Amino acid sequence: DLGKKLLEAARAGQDDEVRILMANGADVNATDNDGYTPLHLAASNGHLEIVEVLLKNGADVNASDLTGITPLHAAAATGHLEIVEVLLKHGADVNAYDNDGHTPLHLAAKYGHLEIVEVLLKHGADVNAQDKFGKTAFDISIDNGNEDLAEILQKLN
């Protein structure tokens, strides 16, 4: 019961409720049937303070959902730069691959998030990572018409 409530409070950005639920014993690593954890939903919905308190209560920074997406994938795809930085600071795996073979760098490129691409690169993103169709972040940029990103990535190896 409490796990499902915690997931919702994290998604919704209800800071007091998140803290009350954890204190009542809600599993910070509870998962729904898509494999979403409170950390996934706080990251995707841009709730940085909630991301931080979840991490302090033992949330698994590298938990994978049913599609293989981790909290860092979620923050990167959704353009949340500050959350990306917090997750990296807590050891999020910069080169985690989802079920399609996409790393956080691939998803940042797909959704056009230049700052996040820069930060992932600085934190050691494998620029040569290939997805299930052999595509790099550079290829994804070209496919999605993100020419400024393509410019940045084209000469990297």
Side-chain angles (χ1 to χ4, degrees):
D1 169 81
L2 292 185
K4 183 166 184 295
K5 288 175 172 54
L6 177 58
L7 192 60
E8 172 57 20
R11 187 205 61 76
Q14 300 295 152
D15 297 28
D16 281 38
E17 195 176 355
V18 162
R19 295 170 186 251
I20 288 168
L21 288 163
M22 291 190 298
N24 276 292
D27 188 354
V28 183
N29 292 304
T31 62
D32 78 358
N33 283 289
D34 277 314
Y36 303 147
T37 65
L39 192 56
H40 281 97
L41 298 194
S44 67
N45 289 268
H47 304 310
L48 184 42
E49 290 71 29
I50 288 170
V51 167
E52 297 180 318
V53 78
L54 289 170
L55 289 165
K56 290 178 186 173
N57 279 260
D60 178 4
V61 76
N62 291 321
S64 304
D65 72 12
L66 190 57
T67 81
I69 271 178
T70 61
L72 179 61
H73 278 107
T78 61
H80 291 100
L81 172 64
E82 300 77 23
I83 294 176
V84 163
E85 288 272 27
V86 167
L87 294 168
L88 289 168
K89 178 188 188 182
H90 290 258
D93 183 3
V94 71
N95 290 315
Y97 289 77
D98 74 7
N99 295 348
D100 289 321
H102 293 134
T103 64
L105 186 73
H106 281 112
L107 299 188
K110 176 177 182 181
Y111 293 98
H113 299 311
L114 181 131
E115 297 89 350
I116 289 165
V117 164
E118 293 184 77
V119 167
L120 291 169
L121 291 174
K122 186 56 66 181
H123 284 258
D126 178 5
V127 74
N128 308 304
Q130 292 178 66
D131 71 8
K132 60 173 179 179
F133 293 152
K135 297 179 176 287
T136 55
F138 165 74
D139 292 324
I140 296 296
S141 300
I142 291 286
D143 294 344
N144 284 273
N146 294 325
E147 255 175 307
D148 288 329
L149 279 186
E151 201 167 316
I152 292 180
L153 295 167
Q154 191 181 25
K155 28 70 183 307
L156 295 181
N157 178 232

